[PDB]
């Protein structure tokens, strides 16, 4: 099977050189939402079941593992993604170029669940390993 690691490294380099960080992040969030459109979890009942199904989806493509936690006082859903695929030294921090893809993917995946209504925002929280991504989801105010 083809190896796209070097191609993705060069593509990330070229995109970061040609366009800015914000444009690249928006494009990657769009790609993540499209990916969530391609593969979806079943309608889950609890956080544990949704976490299991999301981990199964991630293992289908080998993009890492995920843990979900509900923060009632913060009124948010903390998403901790481990072992994000690394494509070169691009990104902030270096090696985390595919993080907006995770933002869009998780936003689409969780907003597709029953009970979600309105506008939601998934932002990346910027000790943890390099490829560990922490995201917080909350209602778009």
């Amino acid at each position: 099977k083809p190896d796209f690691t070097l191609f993705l490294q060069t593509l990330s380099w070229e995109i970061d050189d040609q366009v800015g960080i914000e444009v690249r992040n928006e494009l990657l969030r769009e790609v993540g939402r499209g990916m969530g459109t391609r593969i979806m979890p079943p309608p889950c009942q609890t956080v544990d079941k949704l976490q299991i199904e999301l981990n199964a989806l991630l293992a289908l493509i080998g993009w890492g593992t995920v843990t979900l936690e509900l923060l009632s006082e913060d009124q948010s859903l903390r998403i901790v993604h481990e072992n994000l695929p690394q494509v070169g030294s691009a990104g902030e921090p270096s090696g985390t170029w595919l993080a907006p893809v995770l933002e869009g993917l998780y936003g689409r995946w969780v907003t597709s669940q029953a009970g979600a209504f309105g506008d939601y925002v998934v932002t990346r929280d910027v000790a943890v390993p390099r490829q560990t991504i922490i995201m917080y989801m909350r209602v778009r105010s």
Partner: protein
């Protein structure tokens, strides 16, 4: 399990979902009760 339900998650997050997921009786249950 000890994890929150998805409906509880979406009520906790806020917005209008906390109102649409407010536990309400079905038509049969409401008619039987009153």
């Amino acid at each position: 399990d000890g994890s929150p339900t998805m409906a509880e998650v979406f009520m906790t997050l806020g917005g209008r979902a906390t109102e649409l997921l407010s536990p309400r009786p079905s038509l049969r249950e409401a008619l039987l009760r009153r």
